Amino acid sequence: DRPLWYPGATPPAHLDGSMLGDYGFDPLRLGTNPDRMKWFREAELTNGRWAMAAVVGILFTDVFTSIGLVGLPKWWEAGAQTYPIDNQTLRTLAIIEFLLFGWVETKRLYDLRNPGSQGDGSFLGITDGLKGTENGYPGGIFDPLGYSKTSPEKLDELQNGRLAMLAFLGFASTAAVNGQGPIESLQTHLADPFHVTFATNGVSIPHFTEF
Amino acid sequence: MKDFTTYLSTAPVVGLGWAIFTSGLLIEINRFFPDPLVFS
Amino acid sequence: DIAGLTPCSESKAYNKLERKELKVLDKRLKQYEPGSAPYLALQATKERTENRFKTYAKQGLLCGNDGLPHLISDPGLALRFNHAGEVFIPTFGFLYVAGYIGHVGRQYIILSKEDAKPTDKEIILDVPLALKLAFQGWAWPLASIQELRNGSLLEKDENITVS
Amino acid sequence: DRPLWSPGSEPPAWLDGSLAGDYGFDPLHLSEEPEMRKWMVQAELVHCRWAMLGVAGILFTSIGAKAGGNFPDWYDAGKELQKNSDIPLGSLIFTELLLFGWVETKRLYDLRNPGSQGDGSFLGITDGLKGKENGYPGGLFDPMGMSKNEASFKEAKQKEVKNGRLAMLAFVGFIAQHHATHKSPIDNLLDHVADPFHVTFATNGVSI
Amino acid sequence: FTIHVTVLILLKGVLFARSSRLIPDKANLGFRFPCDGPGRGGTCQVSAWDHVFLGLFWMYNSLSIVIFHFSWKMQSDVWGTVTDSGVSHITGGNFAQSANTINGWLRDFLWAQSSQVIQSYGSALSAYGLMFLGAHFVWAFSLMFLFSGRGYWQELIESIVWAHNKLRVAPSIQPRALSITQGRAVGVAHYLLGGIATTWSFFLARIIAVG
Amino acid sequence: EIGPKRGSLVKVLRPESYWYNQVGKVVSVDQSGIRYPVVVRFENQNYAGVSTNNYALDEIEEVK
Amino acid sequence: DFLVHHAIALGLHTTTLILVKGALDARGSKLMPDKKDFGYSFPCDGPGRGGTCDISAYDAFYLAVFWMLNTIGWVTFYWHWKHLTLWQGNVSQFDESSTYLMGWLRDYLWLNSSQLINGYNPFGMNSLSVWAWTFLFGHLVYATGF
Ligand code: CLA
Ligand code: CLA
Ligand code: CLA
Ligand code: CLA
């Protein structure tokens, strides 16, 4: 077990066992039954892995935007910029997004139920590559860099993934009361820290004391 | 004191503290953001 | 609009009802002096009344021929015509609170019955335990489906019958 | 075997006399249980230590105001200093609430579990940040070795409490003889020293 | 007539408390007991307690009339504004002609003096208009207790205990229906409270808004 | 021994009983040929206030 | 009209519950495992077992009639007033006042009971005197049952 989210005396009951990114953080005891703890673990990954690849489109691009290299729009209004384009792809995108994910995800849903269960003649000829080593960590998807014996580079995958999940929650909240992008919000806290915060300007609290 | 805390743990007393909380919370929730009907 | 109802902003009876309810206070305000406390009390009520009417109009409510706001319940029409906060969203707010009361009381009942003299624990509560469960019930839906999918929610024909 | 608040009264059974500033004073039978007693001695000391730290701040300013320096009354000081400050209210509060939640929480879990914060998690500090006693830490909060002797540590605990009880009574004084006179504490002192017989609480126009 | 009857109910309970022809041994059963049994054709409300429970309704009925007498008489024949030419009573002196008929007590007292209470919405007397209704609710609510019996209720709770048992959420303190004696007491209490509170609203609103 | 063991819990099968499909401790068992020997004690009271009753061999079965 | 329909549903569902219970629990209850041996209509099983007054299926039908009359009352009170406003031409009377209970007591009951109550006045008598007499006659018979 890795260090404790409280340094002091918060005894966990079922997290002493091995697992990735185990810091003993389960007050509500939602991981008591092991069968559904096994399910929530994969949820942290798909949310972790998806959130990180999403945060780059908000982050890697807006940094280049504030510097002035590109004139792309902000994420809070990128959706209304696509469909008015002459060469556009109007909303058959919601449904095709579901028809495409529905094929992959149920293949992932039936793996957690029956691990390594991809029949011999079910797919054309690549039935062997689709078998996975463990749940959440398949083999033939990564081309290099998964043959070490100390496999816990996974801890980087989680600490980076949990962090990004905070980012989008902050992007969405910052972009609902500040009215500006995430990086524009950063340039202000650096230029005038004490004035631009969640307390006084960002109306997250009813503070009206003009005296 | 062990018996006093036990008296305070009876049903009539714990319910009195509950009522002051729920009623105090609702009245305070009507005093500020006055008379709500539609939720934004 | 829908169901032959006008919005409250465009209605005449809605504004008629505002001019009426303010006229009662203005007549009542004439009796007292300007700087007195009864004057301050009525002016505040006037300020609240003016705020109640404009906020209900701003919220896209629907007022009928009588001039009073009406609510819509079908989520389809509510979402289509932007009237979801009225009924459809109040339903989820209450269910989360109602479930929280159930998941808490159910756990206090089960845990006290695992010990000696559970009858005393009902009339003389274990307040440290009750507060512990009351602050652990924020994610009550997760535990329910966890307990349903597991099968430890329901009892199985170990209950008393009558015939 | 020791002095008491009212001579001749039988002291309570739970107040043995080991605690600092123990005079057998608990008619309400509070701190009769070990766990509550373990909580109150830590509550008394913080209410003390904040009183000393605060009351000294009032005397320093009220003396500097009487001498000529630009210091305001301890009352209505947060109102006139915020009018002309670059830090808005709200950014100053949750800089205090957020920073104290760290300390105030670590102090809590040393109470519920002694020696727990010395695991070395916080920046690799182990020998410090583990409590010597309940409300009396050391190592880092005692840079000078003024606590590695039980003979001189037991009486210092008696002075920390005696100058403290006195201190948080004084803060109640400032509240009271401000509401009556609406003047600084030091000004009320020089008046009593000037005409002791005439200017007392009886002649303030209040409390009668 | 209302006083001689109220004495009959109480005095009968006193003398026949210790023994009667129907039940020669009541003293061993005690002061308050619901019934000896379905035998002798029926022995329900034979105790002295149940005589008091009956005397309350009569006593309440007798006292209510002694109040209507004071209100209509003093409004019509006594109270009023004095002018240059005599006195103008509140109800024009209608006690002499209308009171002889029961319909007069329904028309000229109830259907008339209830105008100030009904029309109290939107004024300072609005609380009396609410209590006027609230008092009717508690009065009727008592009828569930007086008319029914603890048998129907105890069986209903069993079918409710099944559901509370099915979900493993049941009280260790078993639920039991209100006792026969309590049921009767609960009735007369909610009965008198609703019967008395109505007048308390029907009077003060009538008289504060003078006439 | 004729019947269940002392101190053993058993489940009732009288349809008439307040304790039907419910569990109780065996207080004692008589081996003299009585029709209803098995004495059982429950924590929950019945409607009258009695918490014990003599049951038979066929009317009781193993727990749960 | 929304609230009136919902109030009706409450009356219909509860009335069925009072009856359905007296039927299914007619054969036996935990309080009385053998009701079938006694009959449909009996007094009670005695003051024992905490009290058994009004258990029989007859006593369930007995209690449902009170609710039945209450349910049909609402159904019928809603028909009359909604039609009076139509016949009088002022439909706005029902729409604005039927949303709160004092409207039912003020505008329907107390108001429309003016010509009736004056059936026999101390000055004279109209043709509605027979109805005011019957009006009270009902008020009295209802009280004698109490
Ligand atoms: C976790 C990452 C994260 C970060 C780095 C920021 C950063 C910022 N937020 Mg923000 N925010 C976040 C999450 C985050 N937020 C989330 C999850 C929410 C929803 C609850 C919000 C809601 C929010 C509002 C409503 C507002 C900001 C604002 C701001 C800016 C000013 C500081 C402030 O108001 O205090 C931040 C206040 C908070 C309550 C969030 C702090 C708590 C986090 C979780 C602690 C994390 C620890 C530490 C900082 C991590 C270091 C990461 C770093 C090295 C990259 C600043 C750029 C203000 C603005 O207008 O921007 C100009 C503003 O009005 N935030
Ligand atoms: C005003 C008179 C009155 C009232 C209010 C009721 C109300 C009720 N009767 Mg009922 N009944 C009555 C007269 C009345 N009855 C009469 C005269 C008879 C014939 C004698 C019956 C015979 C009868 C039978 C046979 C049955 C009922 C049943 C019921 C319940 C049905 C379920 C329900 O509707 O949910 C609730 C309805 C309400 C109106 C809620 C009432 C409580 C409100 C919400 C007040 C809330 C409390 C508030 C906080 C104030 C508390 C403060 C105070 C404690 C100090 C219900 C509570 C049935 C039942 O058992 O239900 C399962 C049933 O079987 N009744
Ligand atoms: C001083 C006057 C007084 C009054 C008015 C009451 C009133 C009450 N007591 Mg009581 N009590 C008293 C003195 C008093 N007590 C004394 C001197 C003792 C000895 C220490 C006790 C010991 C005692 C015990 C052991 C119990 C009561 C219980 C009760 C409640 C009966 C259960 C019920 O009907 O609701 C039924 C409740 C439900 C079906 C669901 C719970 C929802 C409730 C209504 C919410 C809580 C209501 C809250 C307490 C109201 C505020 C208090 C009120 C009097 C202002 C009732 C409100 C019982 C109880 O459980 O209290 C609630 C109970 O077990 N009392
Ligand atoms: C944890 C307590 C608890 C729980 C989980 C339930 C759960 C349930 N009850 Mg219920 N009930 C309770 C207490 C509880 N009840 C109490 C105290 C009473 C006496 C007034 C009743 C009387 C009752 C009746 C008459 C009926 C139910 C019914 C039901 C079922 C449908 C929900 C409903 O509408 O009920 C009704 C909800 C209430 C009457 C409100 C209960 C009062 C409060 C809000 C709940 C008590 C919480 C508790 C005091 C807090 C303790 C917490 C602890 C940490 C200290 C459902 C499974 C119905 C059913 O049979 O299902 C088909 C039904 O007809 N209950």
Ligand code: CLA
């Ligand atoms: C903590 C110690 C303390 C000290 C040193 C003082 C000192 C003073 N107070 Mg004061 N006061 C205090 C506490 C204290 N007060 C408390 C707790 C209250 C609230 C009850 C008051 C309420 C108060 C009012 C209302 C007034 C004063 C006034 C005064 C001044 C004139 C003395 C007088 O009129 O007698 C008044 C004395 C008292 C009412 C007794 C106070 C109670 C404490 C416990 C007294 C004993 C303190 C300590 C144990 C012994 C001294 C320690 C040390 C000096 C040796 C003087 C500077 C007057 C003033 O403004 O001066 C012009 C004035 O009008 N005080």
Ligand code: CLA
């Ligand atoms: C003996 C004491 C007593 C008396 C005398 C009364 C008298 C009365 N009560 Mg009652 N009441 C009492 C006790 C009493 N109460 C008690 C203890 C309670 C419970 C606490 C109640 C609760 C109660 C309620 C709830 C009500 C009454 C009401 C009434 C009045 C009935 C209204 C009426 O019918 O008008 C006069 C009746 C007539 C003019 C018709 C007379 C019928 C005659 C006698 C029969 C003739 C039949 C015919 C000629 C034969 C035909 C034969 C063929 C050839 C055609 C009436 C004056 C009602 C009321 O308040 O009035 C609004 C009401 O609803 N009472």
Ligand SMILES: CC1=C[C@H](O)CC(C)(C)[C@@H]1/C=C/C(C)=C\C=C/C(C)=C\C=C/C=C(C)\C=C/C=C(C)\C=C/C1=C(C)C[C@H](O)CC1(C)C
């Ligand atoms: C709040 C806020 C606000 C303001 O305004 C701003 C700021 C300051 C920014 C803040 C925030 C922060 C955060 C939270 C976050 C960020 C970032 C991250 C975490 C991530 C990314 C990002 C992340 C990520 C993961 C991305 C990428 C990665 C990867 C691996 C991909 C791919 C791959 C894989 C799969 C495997 C193979 O074999 C290989 C490859 C092909 C190579």
Ligand code: SF4
């Ligand atoms: S009160 Fe009930 S149980 Fe007693 S004799 Fe009468 S009907 Fe039977």
